[PDB]
Design a protein around this ligand. Sequence first.
Ligand SMILES: CC(=O)N[C@H]1[C@@H](OP(=O)(O)OP(=O)(O)OC[C@H]2O[C@@H](n3ccc(=O)[nH]c3=O)[C@H](O)[C@@H]2O)O[C@H](C)[C@@H](/N=C/c2c(COP(=O)(O)O)cnc(C)c2O)[C@@H]1O
Ligand SMILES: CC(=O)N[C@H]1[C@@H](OP(=O)(O)OP(=O)(O)OC[C@H]2O[C@@H](n3ccc(=O)[nH]c3=O)[C@H](O)[C@@H]2O)O[C@H](C)[C@@H](/N=C/c2c(COP(=O)(O)O)cnc(C)c2O)[C@@H]1O
Lengths: 385, 385
Amino acid sequence: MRFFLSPPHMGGNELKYIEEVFKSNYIAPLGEFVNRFEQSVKDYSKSENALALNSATAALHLALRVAGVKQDDIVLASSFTFIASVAPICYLKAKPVFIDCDETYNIDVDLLKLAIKECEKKPKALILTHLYGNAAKMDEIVEICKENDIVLIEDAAEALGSFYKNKALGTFGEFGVYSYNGNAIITTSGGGMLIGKNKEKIEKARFYSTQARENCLHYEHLDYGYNYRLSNVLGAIGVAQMEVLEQRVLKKREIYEWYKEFLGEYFSFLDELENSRSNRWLSTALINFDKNELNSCQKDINISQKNITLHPKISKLIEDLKNKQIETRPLWKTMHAQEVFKGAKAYLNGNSELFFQKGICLPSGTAMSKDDVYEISKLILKSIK
Amino acid sequence: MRFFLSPPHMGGNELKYIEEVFKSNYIAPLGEFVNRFEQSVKDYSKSENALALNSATAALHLALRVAGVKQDDIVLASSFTFIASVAPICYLKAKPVFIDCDETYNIDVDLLKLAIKECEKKPKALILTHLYGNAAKMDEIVEICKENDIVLIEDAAEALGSFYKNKALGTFGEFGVYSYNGNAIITTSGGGMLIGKNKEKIEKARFYSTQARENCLHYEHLDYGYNYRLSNVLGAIGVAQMEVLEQRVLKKREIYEWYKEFLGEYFSFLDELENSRSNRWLSTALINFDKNELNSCQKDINISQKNITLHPKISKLIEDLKNKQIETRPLWKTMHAQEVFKGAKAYLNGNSELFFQKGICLPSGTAMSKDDVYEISKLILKSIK
Ligand SMILES: CC(=O)N[C@H]1[C@@H](OP(=O)(O)OP(=O)(O)OC[C@H]2O[C@@H](n3ccc(=O)[nH]c3=O)[C@H](O)[C@@H]2O)O[C@H](C)[C@@H](/N=C/c2c(COP(=O)(O)O)cnc(C)c2O)[C@@H]1O
Ligand SMILES: CC(=O)N[C@H]1[C@@H](OP(=O)(O)OP(=O)(O)OC[C@H]2O[C@@H](n3ccc(=O)[nH]c3=O)[C@H](O)[C@@H]2O)O[C@H](C)[C@@H](/N=C/c2c(COP(=O)(O)O)cnc(C)c2O)[C@@H]1O
């Protein structure tokens, strides 16, 4: 393939810091660059607490554990998301209630109110995805969660570098998670950060992350925990990648603006919320789309596996570009159509399914030039007419 | 500290292979060195299947999941072990039944038979620790598990490089796990390998390891999974470390033989099983110990948190050596005395608690010379008389 969605983009101080790790001989999930990695996420996000982990999935698992979610507790979540977001609900055997999205790709604010209202019992938490870097309607969701005493866990796994009203996505919730998996805006080759408001709670996540050891020489355990802690070698990568995070954000936004410029007449590019700044982690576009097709229903279902057919120009577009060795992908297939979540409760308004029909993820690698985006865009244009 | 239990010992091709990873641009939990890492574990262990993961804890979690352990299923396990071994029982909300150890530090064979006999229902699996690299009585345990249709999962997390009757520890069970955490005989700075007999099953673990995706472009999920997959950068480390594994094994055994030579008159060093080869991951020694103190009881309890006092010469020995900047540690404090496992069923014969009293983990780093071991040993001798 010539172009991937969002491959690694390295070329900083990664090797240099890794060599410092080798010199230290802390070849372990702890050490100076774990610490520095967490410092850098605090410096950037302005969250006061950060815990370097091996994945954002782990971060969410810990956020939920530390929030006191138990078996059969209700956890609200975004339907329009990647399964990692909600897999931890399954780990804790909590009961997921999935909620459709709005014009930002994120949980719809009125559906949220509906879903909470109709829970058979007070929901304990909400995992809010910020899909593709886009901010959800935070003042509203935050307030709703405050009003209902719902722990907000922002899943900003795709949204490191996104902002709403000058605040880092991740810093509104009690908890925030960022991914540094291989295709994230920056990477540790696999990694994550759990940030949060409560220093005790984060430090409790920290305790869980290293097998729930009491502070003593022998092994003493009042609870059970995990091995979730991030490798210091990978922490080094994290540090060097954090050095270019903002540069990456700035570039992903340029690439999106380019796509808009080359494809604007023929695709719909939904706007980020005024008073936000999406990291545009992937540039996405909707074909044959009118915003007034949104909210074509308001219902709750028990989920069944559902086959959703791509708009024909999307499936052709994917195939055409694949033949020219350009990776594109459908938008995330809603959890409300997934077999894994058979039986679980979901609120629909039609939107996530409609986005899956008409949407596409475009190559958004920050190593691409304008000319790259240009040649990709004209193959996209060739394909559709 | 001048000497740690088992720090990283690098100095091979680690940086070289990491640089190859950077050149590849697979800065992700997949790629060539993940693959090569798994190949090397197959070449060495002779297991036909290997799955590179971020920890041995993950490996065990997957071994249990894939074995079909469900909530409230009984899982037998070693008491004398590190909590990571049994934490996955907790993840699946299975019911642990812990079993005391014999003169090898591993599950006693008769107690095992007892515990199985008295289970309120057929136990689904057994997680057998091979403590400190030492082989448990495999022909017996294997047979017992076969007879009772118990899935044997060897926890060889500490025993990479150990053998029983010419077979790699890890390759007797349906599943085997190895750790490459920061203090293991070799390291990836955090990592593990799930090996096993059944290629389907291992590949099923593989599927779970990357979020349980159906093989298609869009995201389609019939089940939920994890993010457990190992980083390719760390895989590179694994490959280069696997190149010295046997050398390390050979060295750990030398160091043990040295400790025996310098401390033999004053400590008891229990022998590995004839027709085995322990990796001697840590050199361990028992003070004021007679083998006939073993099996001083045969009872089942419901666990309560129990304070076990070190033999005074052990606690003094630890303090004395700590003051000379040498790390020593007690032996692993049995799960049958841990608060976390309050209420759970445990079979005792006295042995694990007696080993905790009189035992010590000695510095066993493979970078140590004979002179190092010598100077450590005479400080040990100074301390005890
Ligand atoms: C391995 C990887 O990159 N995983 C991310 C990805 O999953 P998936 O689509 O299954 O992965 P693939 O694209 O098949 O993986 C191929 C890898 O090869 C790499 N690559 C390819 C070519 C090359 O030359 N070099 C290279 O390295 C790619 O950049 C990529 O990382 O796509 C998802 C959208 C991401 N989402 C994670 C997520 C979580 C959980 O984060 P966690 O992954 O646990 O940190 C929580 N919530 C939400 C809303 C999330 O979205 C995953 O982190
Ligand atoms: C981080 C680490 O090394 N963890 C291993 C260790 O846990 P713990 O005692 O809490 O760790 P500490 O010694 O406090 O960690 C300090 C780290 O700093 C490193 N270090 C220190 C000085 C230096 O200069 N450089 C340096 O890097 C050390 O080598 C060490 O790795 O000691 C346990 C005995 C190991 N056991 C794991 C296990 C599992 C699960 O394996 P997993 O860890 O999930 O791969 C399943 N079953 C069984 C029977 C197991 O035993 C853990 O893998």
